[PDB]
Amino acid sequence: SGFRKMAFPSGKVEGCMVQVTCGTTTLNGLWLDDVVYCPRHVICTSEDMLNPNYEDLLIRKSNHNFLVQAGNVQLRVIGHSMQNCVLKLKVDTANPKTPKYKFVRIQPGQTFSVLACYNGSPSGVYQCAMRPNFTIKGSFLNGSCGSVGFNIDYDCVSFCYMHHMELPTGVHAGTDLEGNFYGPFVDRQTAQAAGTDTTITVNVLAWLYAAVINGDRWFLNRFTTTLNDFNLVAMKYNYEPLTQDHVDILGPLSAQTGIAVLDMCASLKELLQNGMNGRTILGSALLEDEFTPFDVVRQCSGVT
Amino acid sequence: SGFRKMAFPSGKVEGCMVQVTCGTTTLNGLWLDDVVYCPRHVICTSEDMLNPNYEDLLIRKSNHNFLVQAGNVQLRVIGHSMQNCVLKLKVDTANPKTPKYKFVRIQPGQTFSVLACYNGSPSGVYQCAMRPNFTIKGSFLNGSCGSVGFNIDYDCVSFCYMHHMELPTGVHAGTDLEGNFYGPFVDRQTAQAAGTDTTITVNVLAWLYAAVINGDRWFLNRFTTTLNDFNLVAMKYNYEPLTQDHVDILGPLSAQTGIAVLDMCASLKELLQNGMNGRTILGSALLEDEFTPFDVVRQCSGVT
Numbered sequence A, B: 001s002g003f004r005k006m007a008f009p010s011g012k013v014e015g016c017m018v019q020v021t022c023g024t025t026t027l028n029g030l031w032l033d034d035v036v037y038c039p040r041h042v043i044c045t046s047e048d049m050l051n052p053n054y055e056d057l058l059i060r061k062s063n064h065n066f067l068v069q070a071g072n073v074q075l076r077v078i079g080h081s082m083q084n085c086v087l088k089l090k091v092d093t094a095n096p097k098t099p100k101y102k103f104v105r106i107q108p109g110q111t112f113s114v115l116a117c118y119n120g121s122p123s124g125v126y127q128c129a130m131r132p133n134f135t136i137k138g139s140f141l142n143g144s145c146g147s148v149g150f151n152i153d154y155d156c157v158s159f160c161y162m163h164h165m166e167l168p169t170g171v172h173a174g175t176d177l178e179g180n181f182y183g184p185f186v187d188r189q190t191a192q193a194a195g196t197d198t199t200i201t202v203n204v205l206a207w208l209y210a211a212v213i214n215g216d217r218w219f220l221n222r223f224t225t226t227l228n229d230f231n232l233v234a235m236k237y238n239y240e241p242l243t244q245d246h247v248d249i250l251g252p253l254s255a256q257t258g259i260a261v262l263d264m265c266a267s268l269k270e271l272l273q274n275g276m277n278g279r280t281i282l283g284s285a286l287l288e289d290e291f292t293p294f295d296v297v298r299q300c301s302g303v304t
């Protein structure tokens, strides 16, 4: 028992982390096969970060300008291209440590592990979620650009996020591995509206199933609700509306505890309207929405 | 900015994880050099776990009885010994993936990363702390025994914890890598008093310095206190008494924010007496004690 904000093991992703320097700017790159993926803002100095013309800035650069270092060894760049907001630097060597990998675009509300990196060297791994408004609440500093978010299905690493920007609001913005920004963000030094964020209702419900599994049952009540009534409450408390698909996804956790999904919604409804009353659920004094139903089943079952 | 419950990267420790079978019991082992360290309860069946005579149970076992598997390859055990509550299985091969390592006994209140493992295969990594009462609040299931806690100083891995027992209270007990149990625990299936746990005051203060660094300043007040007055409050709220050594350790975070350590104690004193009032500090509705001052400086500076 016990419930931790567990991240996937980062070894497979550490073997791919390289440093990419371009001019005075240094950041992280991801080396898989004979290619190094990194944010395109590596070609920018501080002045032109206000409104950069990346097509124009990339034209004054040639393969010899992209200094890629895999730890201490220099990688020979034999090709370069811009795909959306990432630069693809083809290197003459394929990463001997390339794991089985996929590039996937996750849905808002999905979770992943992030391996923070500075100068192509890792510092830590933390589990986090893609907010409903496509931002991430990461822990990132200058030079963490190029740090990736990922998932691991047994041996395959599904790379879902490359880190790019820190919004003036302290939250982070990034892209999928094809250079597509999650959310409305652009790679410019301009204040950007992240939009209204909500609470991922299905994940909160999943975390309530993980509490019952792990002994915390105080919030369980003798009530039930409908999806209609629940959503009236969920809108007021700025929670994502619960759909029938969410209920079906919660099927396995509902079968493990024997607590119907609308019965769990009644517990959530009461907690939303009354608060925790100074009590904690899984050592937390707030409703946690960063554990999807798959994470709860995986952690409470033991998927390696 | 941002503050995450960040764990150290687990790659160096993944390369050491092996499966150890002995009879019907399978658990995890740590392969460093030509030795595999694992909990001694691997030699127990379910019946004799009530009160086992480990010296007697180890006598009916020989090197060929310890099935050690490094992924898919079988390791040849050429020697075995019991050191306190761990078994040291000498294997004819030295782990090609052995990192620079140390075996250290951490102080209560110190933090470390845990790589949970089932059948010598890792599943996740989470950051946690050694409670003042020598227990850990981990996320562990059956077969997670042998999962290790560790710290990483640039390239050296300081192994501090081997996981052994789950107390009936849902909290976890384990040993240092010399087989010495942290706390009063024994490796028997008997209910064990974990003792009164307190809040690690220095870590809460450190987390308050990490909040000010990351923008959360609502809890800052126009008051100050003395160590004497603070400790009167700390005892009532079951917090560890703050010593002059704790204050000196908080020196760097106090110099970074310009907020005296007794000025931060006044903020903590007021939060302890008034609660959070429905507000959050670093996305938490409770005072967090699982980040030491070294972790806060490391995360807010970027130590790789």
Ligand SMILES: COc1ccc(Cl)cc1CC(=O)Nc1cncc2ccccc12
Residues within 6 Å of the ligand: A041, A049, A140, A141, A142, A143, A144, A145, A164, A165, A166, A167, A172, A186, A187, A188, A189, A190, B001
């Ligand atoms: C003005 O810098 C821009 C503008 C636009 C873009 Cl696309 C990228 C950057 C670089 C960036 O935001 N880096 C950082 C990402 N995370 C955290 C950071 C913490 C401190 C400083 C920079 C941090």
Ligand SMILES: COc1ccc(Cl)cc1CC(=O)Nc1cncc2ccccc12
Residues within 6 Å of the ligand: A001, B041, B049, B140, B141, B142, B143, B144, B145, B164, B165, B166, B167, B172, B186, B187, B188, B189, B190
């Ligand atoms: C009765 O089992 C004993 C007694 C004494 C000792 Cl020394 C070791 C064990 C094995 C053990 O506690 N394993 C587990 C460690 N963490 C979490 C566990 C969750 C579920 C089941 C076992 C879990």
